[PDB]
Design a protein around this ligand. Structure first.
Ligand code: L6G
Ligand code: K
Ligand code: K
Ligand code: ZN
Length: 359
């Protein structure tokens, strides 16, 4: 009944080894540790993914390329921003992939009902292409592992960006339903995920996309999320949940799009947790490093049912938490561009889609 926390010092080191979002994994763990939350969790060392395990989703060519350049340093694999240093990407991918598979296996084995991998959630990676800071799609690997036991998986993606890599992976199946809430605007990455994108073939109506505009705040976001998830839960009756909680929705993120705080995301998390299903918790985006640690530490508190002290405790990264040194994040003074009539249209459209879903 205690949550599983996927962690080792070696894993945190590997997760920070590419320095794409410098030291973020260490900041997140260090803040969790400073609040002593790890003492309330079952700490599990992640396994490293085998080639075979990564190949349940990624192509041999892509994986063999990563392994080759790990040894020796031309096809487009999405690696063109990594020329100064590609040799570490294979081990990074095997670590992230293994950690999420380990979390999924803990759920399968009934070790826990909630398993956390805050340095996973890399939802944009394609079978044969890195994308959007994602080199391996560990979320897909986790869902595939859960499908060995659970007959219907719900994937919920609350990252600022559309979870295109995961949606695409399961587009043709009705056994995995993907739900993504995200900014959707012409020109905005990755460009996919309009409300009319509902999946394909046998998977038609088993993808759910909620396009949202700049400036959304906690209350309206939760109303939208609760509305959709209530309908999804009734229609699809999931047996396990994978939840991606990218913190690039949070006020202060350089993405500067949504205007959320961790309390709003936490209400979404609480709604999902009260289903009492096996739940795999993942991180993802989050580019204000201190705020991302604030967010995921607060959400770890939510999982544990604990109220955390407002004051950030002294720890390795304490200087980064200025100028106010508190856990709470204040929304930015920016307008909400979400008009109530369009949001209601979107909800109504999704309701119509979900009427088709029959288990
Ligand atoms: C500078 C920013 C634009 C940054 N990008 C980059 O640092 C690089 C590596 C340098 S230039 C570039 N990528 C680029 C050109 S076109 C394109 N990216 C489309 N991809 C995105 O916009 C993803 C997007 C990431 C989204 C997080 C998804 S959780 N990236 C970025 O915010
Ligand atoms: K999303
Ligand atoms: K699907
Ligand atoms: Zn994102």
């Amino acid at each position: 009944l205690v949550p599983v926390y996927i962690y080792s010092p070696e894993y945190v080191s590997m997760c920070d080894s590419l320095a794409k979002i410098p030291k973020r994994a260490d900041m997140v763990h260090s803040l969790i540790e400073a609040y002593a939350l790890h003492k309330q969790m079952r700490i599990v060392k992640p396994k490293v993914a085998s080639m075979e395990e990564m190949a349940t989703f990624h192509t041999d060519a892509y994986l063999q390329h990563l392994q080759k350049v790990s040894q020796e340093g031309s096809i487009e694999y999405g690696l063109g921003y990594d020329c100064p240093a590609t040799e570490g990407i294979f081990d990074y991918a095997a670590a992230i992939g293994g950690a999420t598979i380990t979390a999924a296996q803990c759920l399968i084995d009934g070790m826990c009902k909630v398993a956390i991998n805050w340095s996973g959630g890399w939802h944009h990676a394609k079978k044969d292409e890195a994308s959007g800071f994602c080199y391996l799609n560990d979320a897909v690997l986790g869902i595939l592992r859960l499908r060995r036991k659970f007959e219907r998986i719900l994937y919920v993606d609350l990252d600022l960006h559309h979870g295109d890599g995961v949606e695409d992976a399961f587009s043709f199946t009705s056994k995995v339903m993907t739900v993504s809430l995200h900014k959707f605007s012409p020109g905005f990455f990755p460009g996919t995920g309009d409300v009319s994108d509902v999946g394909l073939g046998k998977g038609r109506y088993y993808s759910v996309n909620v396009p949202i505009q700049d400036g959304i705040q906690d209350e309206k976001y939760y109303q939208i999320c609760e509305s959709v998830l209530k309908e999804v839960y009734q229609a699809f009756n999931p047996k396990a949940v994978v939840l991606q909680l990218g913190a690039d929705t949070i006020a202060g993120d350089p993405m500067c799009s949504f205007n959320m705080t961790p309390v709003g995301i936490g209400k979404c998390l609480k709604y999902i947790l009260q289903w009492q299903l096996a739940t795999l918790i993942l991180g993802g985006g989050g580019y204000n490093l201190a705020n991302t640690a604030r967010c995921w530490t607060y959400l770890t508190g939510v999982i544990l049912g604990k109220t955390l002290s407002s004051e950030i405790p002294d720890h390795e990264f304490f200087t980064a938490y200025g100028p106010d040194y508190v856990l709470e994040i204040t929304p930015s003074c920016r307008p909400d561009r979400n008009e109530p009539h369009r949001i209601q249209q979107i909800l109504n459209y999704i309701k119509g889609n979900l009427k088709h879903v029959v288990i």
